[PDB]
């Protein structure tokens, strides 16, 4: 064996004695004499010479075993060693440059790595290329939590990636490995309860049983079994939290209850027998909801469809409800029915669907006959937030809702396909009024309801702040595993999920899915893979 | 480490003592023990065995750190070391030869590098091939500024590049690296204010914010946001400077004012109310302009379009102007209107557009009604050089001007596509009379006005002389960077800009552009790349 020391090892060990004697300094330990996986990144053919693919700062989170030792040590010093293992192919060509940028030099487009002291990494190289990162520091050690100025390691393109075949494969994965150098050390042992990295890197909020087991949608309390790409984009803001500690709308993520107190009621016809109860209140009159005034908590964020007579409306959002009077309200016994809720204009006359929340008014009209109908000005609804979809006959209409049917509040970040990546919409099997036995078997296709993000994602995203956990212009990429395929799934700053399906509207089943993995953040110029079982 | 000395190192150091003791001679310095980037060049498949790809003279500008040390030292001696890193591919084949030509042998087609002492560089080689250049000199050192006879290093084709796939990829980038040898030294320290290389190599005149920020066109004071290729060529000579210290035409590059003093005026109709003022003066009567007599400074260099009646003319060059009499002129109050300027023949009768400046006469006819119209023989215009384009309705006509509409003076160097490279025309968003709210959004496509070269290029090209900064038969190539692509952009001896788009007329947006880089000059047989996001 041969462990490479750094160029500054004599003064790295000596000045780090201000932390006491060096700790975990034993060169026969086999967490120090082996390279271990750190990161992976995509070098595509569309990258110019001089473009930066991989930047990382000198830190003990670069090695999986010095990041385990870092929670019991309040300080570190010494260099590190990096290995680069190109997947590549013998038909691929182009080089890379890896160099150690000193502190005080910022990393970006004007940085010219090719005139630093560097190493050259070919795309078709067998033996991996090793660079050594010295610990060039203006301090004597780096305290864990406020390490100060550290060297950066930058992987630029020396010669751009050429593929003589043409299209198809246009990306090469490069695997970074990390091993401590001879002069690495920890100092000043601390209790492990003290922590520095508190983001849940944003990796822990989506694990493997979220997609092949427990976990649900933002529109129904239904198990996620599909993900369906949509070209052009869509917008959802009800229970869709961004990476920061805020959201744009009502409906905190819990399927408990929708309860409103004020709102007038009416019914058509001169006879108060076997009619449809139709209830309205304007947007912005919900004083009881502490988040937003525009809608009560749990109101469905689609457009109301205009229907009349005894015909069942196509698609929508129906759920069993009740009508209660005010002044310490007892709900009326003879008014319990299915009610369809949404947004409309011009009640109770000509009803039109609405796209913007401002200038609208919330509606709730029954789809079934009720023997009694009230017309009192103080009235309210009592519906549960779990709902189904009403259809005239069983069949299979479409995935609901459409991207255009969803109402957005003013000031919502829209999903936009960047590159070949397109947004996705997590589907779930839901029951319908035309066929309550919507088991996933024969007798036509079952109905699918699509939402934006999973509910464990929303729950783990509500509490914590991720203002610096993911740099803008990137999305965090998981590595989903299937039986005969695998996908990369993004998560941008707006909370939306991305996939590299391109212009296709085919539902992909997470039936054979096994495991998801953390990788890190990857920028938007890198296309997520679509190597599936097709 | 192992630093290779030269074959003449014992007599290189000894005779360089006429400059005093050797300076910067310390072999542990890490600017001496590492290879650094010097140049890159394209070896395509269309290159014969014996053709020269890369020639460079022995000089301290070959290394980025001995070129920084050269401004504080008036003399150098000793060899150099060159490394060659082929991008290549395992499917590519063919060799190269690198040899050190002695002084007194000129470099060209009759030079036969294969029988010099040489090294062979394969297209598919992993480890880079190192040659050493000794300092074979008839002097004792080379003074910086007049170095005298130096050896040349010539990269010829040993076997021509073969690609078994066919077309697509037909070029391989080879990267030259440079490191000083053991006997390199500087002598006779000088003040750094003395300089030798004063060309702004012609690299510094176009930086990155010229294309993604400040910077403008030769026809309008508008921000450059497009570049549009044109097959067949075009000609522009108004504010288009060549690499030498001259230009062919009027209009020094500044959008200040166009002011003429002499020229007759006329108006149609027997009633002097609500008419169009039409003004003419011949070409060559502008005594006030010190550059050229044929047009006043700021006159638009297109052909006038013939229009009559109340109809708005299609395209053109309109700008708000005024008419003033002579003899210490006070401009007339009741004549301020939009005026369209250009070149026509046969005023004031049958007006025809003109292609040649000689045999023409400049015209200026209003497009809007003016309540007063004069007919006095001494009269002049007062228009500002910033202008818009007049259109009948909003829409999107075409990019203006067309290549055929531009008037050329006799003796103008025409842009001609050489190889697959074609000339480009930098577009800019300009306002129009049919739609003044031409923001780059919805409501049809905005109008684009195309010019030849940027205005910082013209300003940095006017003052200095580049008679030897760029050898003829080449163009200087920048490396433009985008988000998902990159281009090479040429600049030939006529000042025109080139790109490898081929026969395509698609506008390429510099919205995602990030940075431009210097590379050097590349000859016209090398095709500029077109690896874009498509």
Features:
part of a larger assembly; 2 chains; mainly beta; elongated; Capsid protein VP60 (chains A, B)
Instruction: Give the amount of beta strand of chain A, in percent.
Output: 25-35%
Q: First CA to last CA of chain A: what distance?
A: 45 Å
Q: Shape of chain A from CA axes?
A: elongated
Give the helix proportion of chain A (percent range): under 10%
Query: Could you tell me the number of beta strands of chain A?
Result: 27
Radius of gyration of chain A, Cα only, in angstroms?
29 Å
- Greatest interface and its residue counts? A-B, 34 and 37 residues
PDB class: virus
Keywords: Calicivirus, cryoEM, virion, assembly, virus
Entry title: CP of empty RHDV virion
Chains A, B: Capsid protein VP60
Structure description:
The structure is cut from a larger assembly and holds two copies of chain A (534 residues). Chain A is mainly beta. Chain A is built from three helices and 27 strands. In chain A, strands 11, 20, 21, 22, 23, 24, 25, 26 and 27 form a nine-stranded antiparallel beta sheet that branches. In chain A, strands 12, 13, 14, 15, 16, 17, 18 and 19 form an eight-stranded antiparallel beta sheet that branches. In chain A, strand 16 and strand 17 (352-353) form a beta hairpin. The longest helix of chain A is centred in the C-terminal third of the chain and has 8 residues, at 455-462. At the A-B interface, strand 6 of A face strand 1 and strand 9 of B. Chains A, B: This is Capsid protein VP60. Chains A, B: Homomultimer. Interacts with host type II histo-blood group structures antigens at the surface of target cells. Chains A, B: It is found in: Virion; Host cytoplasm.
